[PDB]
Structure formats: structure tokens, C-alpha cells
Coordinates of N, CA and C in Angstrom, one line a residue:
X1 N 0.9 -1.2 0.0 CA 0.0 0.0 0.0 C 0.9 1.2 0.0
X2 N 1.7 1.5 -1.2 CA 2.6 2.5 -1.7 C 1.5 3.4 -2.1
X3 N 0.7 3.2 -3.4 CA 0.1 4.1 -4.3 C -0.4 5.3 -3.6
X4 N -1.2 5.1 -2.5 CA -2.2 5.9 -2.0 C -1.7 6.5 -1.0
X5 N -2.1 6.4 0.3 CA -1.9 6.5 1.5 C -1.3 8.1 1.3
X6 N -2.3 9.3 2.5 CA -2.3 10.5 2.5 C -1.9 11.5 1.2
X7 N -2.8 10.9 0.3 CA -2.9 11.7 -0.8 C -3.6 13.2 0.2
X8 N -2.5 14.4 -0.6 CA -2.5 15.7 -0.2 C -2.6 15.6 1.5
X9 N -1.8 17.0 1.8 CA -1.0 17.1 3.0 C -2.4 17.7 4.0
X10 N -3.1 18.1 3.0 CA -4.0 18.7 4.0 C -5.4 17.4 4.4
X11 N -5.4 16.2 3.5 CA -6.4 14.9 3.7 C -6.5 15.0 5.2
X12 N -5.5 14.6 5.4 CA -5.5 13.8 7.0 C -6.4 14.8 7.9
X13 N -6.1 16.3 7.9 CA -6.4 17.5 8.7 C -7.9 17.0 8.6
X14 N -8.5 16.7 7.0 CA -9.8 17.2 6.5 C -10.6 15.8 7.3
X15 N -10.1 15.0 7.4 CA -10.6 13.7 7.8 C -10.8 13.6 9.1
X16 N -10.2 14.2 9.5 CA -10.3 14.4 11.4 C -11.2 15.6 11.9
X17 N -10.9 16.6 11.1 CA -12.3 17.4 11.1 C -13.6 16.9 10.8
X18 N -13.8 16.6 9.9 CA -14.9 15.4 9.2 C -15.7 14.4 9.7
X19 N -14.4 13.6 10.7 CA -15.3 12.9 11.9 C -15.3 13.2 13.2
X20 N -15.1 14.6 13.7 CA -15.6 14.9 14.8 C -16.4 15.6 14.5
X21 N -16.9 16.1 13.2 CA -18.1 16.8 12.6 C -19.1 16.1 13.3
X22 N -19.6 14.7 12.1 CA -20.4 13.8 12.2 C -20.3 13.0 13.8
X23 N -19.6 12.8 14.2 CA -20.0 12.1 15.9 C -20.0 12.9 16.8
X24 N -19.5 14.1 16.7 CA -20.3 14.9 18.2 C -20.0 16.5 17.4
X25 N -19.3 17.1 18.9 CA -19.4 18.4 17.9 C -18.8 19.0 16.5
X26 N -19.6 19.8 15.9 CA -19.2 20.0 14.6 C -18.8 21.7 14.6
X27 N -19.0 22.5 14.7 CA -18.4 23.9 15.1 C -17.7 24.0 16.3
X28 N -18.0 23.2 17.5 CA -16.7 23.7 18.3 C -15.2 23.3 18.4
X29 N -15.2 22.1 17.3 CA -14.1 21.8 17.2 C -13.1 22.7 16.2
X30 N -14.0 22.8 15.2 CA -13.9 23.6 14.4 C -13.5 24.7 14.5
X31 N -14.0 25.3 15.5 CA -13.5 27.1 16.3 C -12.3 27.0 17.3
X32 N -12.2 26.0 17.8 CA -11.0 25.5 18.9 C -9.9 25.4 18.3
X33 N -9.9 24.7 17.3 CA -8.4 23.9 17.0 C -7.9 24.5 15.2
X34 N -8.6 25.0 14.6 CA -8.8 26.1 13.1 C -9.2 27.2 13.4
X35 N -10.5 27.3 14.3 CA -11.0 28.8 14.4 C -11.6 29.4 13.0
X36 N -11.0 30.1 12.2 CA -11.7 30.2 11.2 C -11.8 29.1 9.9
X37 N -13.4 28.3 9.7 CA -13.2 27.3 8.7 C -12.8 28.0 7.5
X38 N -13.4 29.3 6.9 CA -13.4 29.9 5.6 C -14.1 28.9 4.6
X39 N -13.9 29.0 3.1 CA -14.6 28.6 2.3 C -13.9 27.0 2.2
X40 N -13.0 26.9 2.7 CA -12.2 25.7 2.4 C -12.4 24.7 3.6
X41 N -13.0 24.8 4.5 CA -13.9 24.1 5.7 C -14.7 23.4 4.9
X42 N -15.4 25.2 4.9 CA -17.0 25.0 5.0 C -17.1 24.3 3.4
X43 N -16.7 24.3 2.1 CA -17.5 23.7 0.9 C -16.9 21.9 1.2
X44 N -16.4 21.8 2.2 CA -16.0 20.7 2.2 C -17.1 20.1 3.1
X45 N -17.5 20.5 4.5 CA -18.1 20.3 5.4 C -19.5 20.2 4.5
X46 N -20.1 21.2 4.1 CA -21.3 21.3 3.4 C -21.6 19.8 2.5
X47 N -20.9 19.4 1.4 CA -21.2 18.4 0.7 C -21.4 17.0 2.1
X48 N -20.3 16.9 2.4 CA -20.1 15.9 3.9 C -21.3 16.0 5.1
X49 N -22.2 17.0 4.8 CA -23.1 17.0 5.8 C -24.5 16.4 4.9
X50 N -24.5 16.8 3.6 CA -25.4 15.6 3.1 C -25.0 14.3 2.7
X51 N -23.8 14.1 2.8 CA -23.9 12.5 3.0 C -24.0 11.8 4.0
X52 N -23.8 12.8 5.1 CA -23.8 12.1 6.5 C -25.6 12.3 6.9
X53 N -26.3 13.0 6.3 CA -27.9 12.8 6.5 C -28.2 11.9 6.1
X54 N -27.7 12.0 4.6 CA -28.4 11.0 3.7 C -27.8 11.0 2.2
X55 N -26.8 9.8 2.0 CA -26.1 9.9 0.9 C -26.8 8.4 0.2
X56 N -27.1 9.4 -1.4 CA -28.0 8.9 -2.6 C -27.0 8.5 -3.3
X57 N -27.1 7.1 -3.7 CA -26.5 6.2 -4.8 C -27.4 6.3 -5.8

């Protein structure tokens, strides 16, 4: 498992944000440890919050 593994430096960051989103809080982690999401959070969080409602195959 060469090929893949932390494709872009910032994945890891977005993944850990992502799932403290979805299992508990989702803006205070966000304000704590980034503070400001900006557009580069939030268009990421936004798609990720409709699949975490309810993602359509």
C-alpha cells in the first residue's frame, strides 16, 4: 500500500475534522483547533453534511 496512503498534505487534517463533525461536535471543534473554517472548511463540510444525513446512490 505504496500508491495511495495521504494523498495531499492537507487529507489527514480534513478527515479528522470530518469525523468529529459527524460524531459529536461540529463547530466547536472547528473554532477551537482552526478557528476560522473559511470557504475551504465550510465547501467541504457542506457536501459531507449531506452524506452524512443522507447519501444517494
Amino acid at each position: 500500500a505504496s500508491m495511495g496512503k495521504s494523498k495531499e498534505i492537507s487529507q489527514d487534517l480534513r478527515k479528522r475534522i470530518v469525523d468529529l463533525y459527524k460524531s459529536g461536535s461540529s463547530l466547536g471543534a472547528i473554532s477551537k483547533r482552526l478557528a476560522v473554517p473559511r470557504s475551504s472548511v465550510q465547501t467541504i463540510v457542506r457536501k459531507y453534511k449531506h452524506h452524512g444525513t443522507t447519501q444517494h446512490h
